[PDB]
Design a protein around this ligand. Structure first.
Ligand SMILES: [Zn+2]
Length: 254
């Protein structure tokens, strides 16, 4: 019941007489424990940027309240001190609008909660190469965090086939300002995977997709630093450390 910022954890709770799980009147959804039928699960995530120092949750049962305290740990993320901090960019109106529009779309998707499992066992990595840029690489103008790498980058020459980390429904399959050519998949229970900077999109919004199924070709779209696959996980409303999430998720749903 310590959690590093930008990570998810799976809380286990007794199923019997459970009524709700709350965080200051935010209801946290619950789903079945796959291997213990007397338990349920909930995903709790702390944001990378500007998280609470401590979190208290209440699980309300028919005959009892149960408090749950989680301290925010800082972790050991690569960070470096920005030296400029003009901090305010001044983009053209046409770009501000497209960003704004795409941000409203994405927030509508990531806020929605499909209350069933759309995945199929464990997550696989979307590509069998290696990490060239880690999740959580931060740029700080003290005393906090100016920007951070909200996913992890795999080495990929332009045109490398990218496969869905798990089964789900495609919710985004288009070119967006920061993500380039983007695929976003709903796996259920508020878990979304993100495949950014693609050179080709091979799926369509609404499509049901299987684990291991081709979703496009890596590229360098929307990416300044050249070709790579940006892979993200959003869970519990927040961007979380994707390889961390996958190992925790797979430890439960294998
Ligand atoms: Zn990235």
């Amino acid at each position: 019941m310590e959690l590093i910022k930008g990570q998810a954890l799976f809380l286990e709770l007794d199923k019997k007489d459970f009524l709700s799980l709350k965080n200051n009147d935010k209801n946290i959804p619950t789903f079945a424990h796959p291997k213990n039928q007397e338990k349920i699960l909930a995903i709790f995530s702390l944001p990378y940027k500007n998280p609470p120092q401590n979190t208290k949750l209440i699980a309300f049962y028919k005959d009892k309240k149960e408090e749950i305290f989680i301290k925010t740990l800082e972790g050991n993320y690569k960070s470096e001190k920005l030296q400029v901090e003009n901090k305010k960019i001044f983009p053209p109106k046409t770009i501000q609008e497209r960003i704004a529009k795409e941000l409203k779309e994405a927030n509508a998707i990531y806020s929605s909660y499909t209350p069933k499992a759309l995945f199929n066992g464990a997550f696989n990595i979307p590509l069998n190469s290696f990490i060239t840029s880690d999740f959580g690489k931060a740029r700080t103008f003290n005393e906090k965090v100016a920007s951070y790498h909200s996913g992890t980058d795999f080495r990929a020459a332009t045109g490398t086939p990218i496969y869905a980390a798990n089964s789900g429904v495609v919710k985004i399959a288009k070119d967006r300002y920061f993500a380039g050519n983007s695929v976003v998949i709903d796996h259920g229970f508020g878990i979304y995977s993100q495949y950014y900077h693609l050179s080709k999109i091979d799926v369509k919004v609404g499509q049901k997709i299987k684990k291991g199924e081709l979703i496009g070709l890596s590229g360098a779209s929307g990416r300044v630093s050249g070709p790579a696959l940006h892979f993200g996980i959003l869970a519990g409303g927040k961007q979380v450390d994707p390889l961390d999430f996958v190992s925790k998720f797979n430890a439960i749903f294998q």
